[PDB]
């Protein structure tokens, strides 16, 4: 129920294989402590592409307060950032810039596609748009929407936190196994199918 990824510099320059979860009880507790610290302090790269970035900085404001999750520092440097939110369209002139900024980020790093443009190109199936940011960089969380509302971005933040909290990474670069192990978690569609199909009645659209 895990995937093993090791990188060695077409993009992405990684190869993944399905592997059994390896997990002493002290090493496991240290791994959960490291994962807890990584998931409760996630610093996003302040990267503005399009309208989805306007919704992201709406999520950062007072009526939403994304600071409650410890994800508010909003670094302008990719070295100091933990999370790349592709919040906008992957234009062909901007795609090498996105690749360069993602390369300049440091491990551990995670990617959230925010919006239909970053997911698959969205409505812009046009000559000057890369059809999704997963064509050239690996994505951890996808948010459908055009735009997603700010609480959808927070929901993806919680999904990323839950994905980090059960993934395995080396504690030190001199001791252990240096490959990155990511959990193959259950899809949210199959998890929410029980509560979504049973919905019967909704409020009529003629009211407030």
């Amino acid at each position: 129920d895990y995937t093993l990824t090791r990188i060695d510099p077409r993009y992405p320059l990684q190869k993944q294989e399905i592997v059994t979860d390896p997990l002493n009880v002290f090493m496991g507790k240290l791994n959960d402590m490291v994962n807890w610290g990584r998931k409760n302090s996630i610093w996003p790269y302040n990267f503005g592409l399009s309208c989805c970035y306007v919704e992201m900085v709406t999520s950062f404001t007072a009526v939403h307060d994304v600071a409650r999750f410890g994800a508010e520092v909003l670094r302008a440097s990719p070295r100091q950032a933990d999370l790349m939110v592709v919040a906008g369209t992957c234009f062909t002139k901007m795609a090498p810039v996105i690749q360069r900024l993602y390369d300049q980020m440091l491990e551990p790093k995670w990617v959230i596609s925010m919006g239909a443009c970053a997911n698959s190109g969205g409505m812009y199936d046009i000559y000057s748009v890369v059809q999704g940011v997963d064509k050239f960089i690996p994505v951890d969380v996808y948010i459908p929407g055009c735009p997603p509302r700010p609480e959808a971005y927070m929901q993806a933040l919680m999904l990323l936190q839950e994905s980090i909290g059960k993934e395995r990474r080396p504690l030190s670069w001199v001791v252990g196994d240096q490959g990155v192990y990511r959990a193959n978690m259950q899809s949210e569609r199959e998890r929410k199918r029980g509560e979504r199909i049973a919905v019967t009645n909704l409020r009529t659209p003629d009211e407030i």
Partner: protein, 180 residues
């Protein structure tokens, strides 16, 4: 620079500090997602479902109007027919990684089958899991339109509704009838 300008600027900095302090003495404007559930209006354009008629059958007649009215083209379906003669989707898939949640498919539906529900929590880990098939879209009730049935309006004869049993329709008169 002028001394009067310096004093006025100092007073303005003090006023700004004072106003931010009184704003600290104010009421919090934050909606505490997810502990506080997000209120959405009934016509909010979120997660797309397919609904059912009040009789319990699925409302979609597989007429492909939503697929062609989609500006992204992220709806795919195929018409199938029952033995009685009613139309239904053999499958129905929406690529939610492509969908812009614009509500044009719901606006184009002549049976009020496809609907956009007030649900935004749709995040996913893999993009292949964002393709929602008919099993992930067909819900147990009528949704936002509790009483509309297209097959009560249509002239086609199906199970439980023969010719002339629809709204504003008369019984069929045979050409062999004795009346002039």
């Amino acid at each position: 620079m002028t001394l009067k300008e310096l004093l006025v600027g100092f007073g303005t900095q003090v006023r700004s500090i004072w106003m931010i302090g009184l704003h600290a003495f104010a009421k919090r404007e934050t909606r505490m997602y997810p502990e506080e559930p997000v209120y959405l209006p009934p016509r909010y354009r979120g997660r797309i479902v397919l609904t059912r008629d009040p009789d319990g059958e699925e409302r979609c007649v597989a007429c492909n109007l939503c697929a062609v009215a989609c500006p992204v083209g992220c709806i795919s379906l195929q018409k199938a027919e029952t033995k009685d003669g009613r139309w239904y989707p053999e499958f129905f898939r929406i690529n939610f990684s492509r969908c812009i949640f614009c509500g044009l498919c719901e606006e184009a539906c002549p049976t009020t089958a496809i609907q956009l529900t007030p649900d935004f929590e749709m995040g996913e880990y893999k993009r292949q899991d964002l393709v929602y098939e008919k099993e992930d879209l067909l819900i147990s009730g009528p949704g936002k339109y509790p009483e509309y049935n297209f097959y009560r309006m249509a002239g086609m004869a199906i199970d439980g509704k023969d010719k002339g049993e629809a709204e504003n329709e008369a019984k069929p008169i045979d050409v062999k009838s004795l009346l002039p």
